[PDB]
Design an enzyme around this catalytic site. Sequence first.
Site, PDB file in Angstrom:
ATOM      1  N   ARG A  82      46.179   1.141   5.234  1.00 24.86           N
ATOM      2  CA  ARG A  82      45.996   0.416   3.989  1.00 24.86           C
ATOM      3  C   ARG A  82      44.556   0.528   3.516  1.00 24.86           C
ATOM      4  O   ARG A  82      43.686   1.019   4.238  1.00 24.86           O
ATOM      5  CB  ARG A  82      46.333  -1.057   4.189  1.00 24.86           C
ATOM      6  CG  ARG A  82      45.439  -1.735   5.212  1.00 24.86           C
ATOM      7  CD  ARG A  82      45.508  -3.251   5.080  1.00 24.86           C
ATOM      8  NE  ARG A  82      46.876  -3.725   4.894  1.00 24.86           N
ATOM      9  CZ  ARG A  82      47.206  -4.993   4.673  1.00 24.86           C
ATOM     10  NH1 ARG A  82      46.264  -5.926   4.609  1.00 24.86           N
ATOM     11  NH2 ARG A  82      48.478  -5.331   4.513  1.00 24.86           N
ATOM     12  N   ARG A  92      40.561   4.143   3.251  1.00 18.08           N
ATOM     13  CA  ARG A  92      41.787   3.672   3.872  1.00 18.08           C
ATOM     14  C   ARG A  92      41.508   3.456   5.349  1.00 18.08           C
ATOM     15  O   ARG A  92      40.494   3.919   5.870  1.00 18.08           O
ATOM     16  CB  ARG A  92      42.897   4.713   3.707  1.00 18.08           C
ATOM     17  CG  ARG A  92      43.157   5.123   2.268  1.00 18.08           C
ATOM     18  CD  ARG A  92      44.500   5.809   2.140  1.00 18.08           C
ATOM     19  NE  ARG A  92      45.577   4.965   2.656  1.00 18.08           N
ATOM     20  CZ  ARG A  92      46.267   4.092   1.928  1.00 18.08           C
ATOM     21  NH1 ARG A  92      46.008   3.943   0.635  1.00 18.08           N
ATOM     22  NH2 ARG A  92      47.227   3.370   2.495  1.00 18.08           N
ATOM     23  N   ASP A  95      43.249   7.839   8.045  1.00 17.94           N
ATOM     24  CA  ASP A  95      43.092   9.041   7.250  1.00 17.94           C
ATOM     25  C   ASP A  95      43.835  10.203   7.884  1.00 17.94           C
ATOM     26  O   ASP A  95      43.756  10.430   9.098  1.00 17.94           O
ATOM     27  CB  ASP A  95      41.621   9.430   7.134  1.00 17.94           C
ATOM     28  CG  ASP A  95      40.778   8.341   6.532  1.00 17.94           C
ATOM     29  OD1 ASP A  95      39.774   7.948   7.166  1.00 17.94           O
ATOM     30  OD2 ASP A  95      41.127   7.883   5.424  1.00 17.94           O
ATOM     31  N   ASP A  97      43.936  14.194   6.688  1.00 16.29           N
ATOM     32  CA  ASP A  97      43.511  15.188   5.713  1.00 16.29           C
ATOM     33  C   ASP A  97      43.864  16.585   6.170  1.00 16.29           C
ATOM     34  O   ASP A  97      43.589  16.962   7.303  1.00 16.29           O
ATOM     35  CB  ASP A  97      42.015  15.102   5.482  1.00 16.29           C
ATOM     36  CG  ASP A  97      41.628  13.824   4.790  1.00 16.29           C
ATOM     37  OD1 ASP A  97      41.937  13.684   3.591  1.00 16.29           O
ATOM     38  OD2 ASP A  97      41.047  12.949   5.452  1.00 16.29           O
TER      39      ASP A  97
END
Length: 158
Positions: A82, A92, A95, A97
């Site tokens: 969140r 957040r 993560d 990525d």
Amino acid sequence: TVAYIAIGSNLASPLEQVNAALKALGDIPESHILTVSSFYRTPPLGPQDQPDYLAAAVALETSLAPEELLNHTQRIELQQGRVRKAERWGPRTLDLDIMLFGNEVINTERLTVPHYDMKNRGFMLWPLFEIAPELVFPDGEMLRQILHTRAFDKLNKW
């Protein structure tokens, strides 16, 4: 295709979160985890001493298109993390990525691969080097050479 995904968490006790995210990654359709790096401790920026950030890298074999993989990593971020009340505009808590997707270069509105800043981030490069020491970027630059020349501090294990 082998995709390399960075995982990060600024939670005080991130292991549960990170492990749950790994479970979720492995269960992405048309995909499976090949290997996961050790978990690393990335010191905070700021004298105050924020929580240590846990960093790791995952190698994921996938038949998904890159944007389809992104759908799933975004979904997992939403389901497993969140934004913090104090900074609704801020980072957040979990993560995921996409750093690399095969040997592709992607420059779309939704997705830029290789990750635009990864060559400047020891916390991305070191875990990646653990699982892919022989990696060569799409532009021909060798991961080993970047680490050897730029001399990023090693990260301690979590």
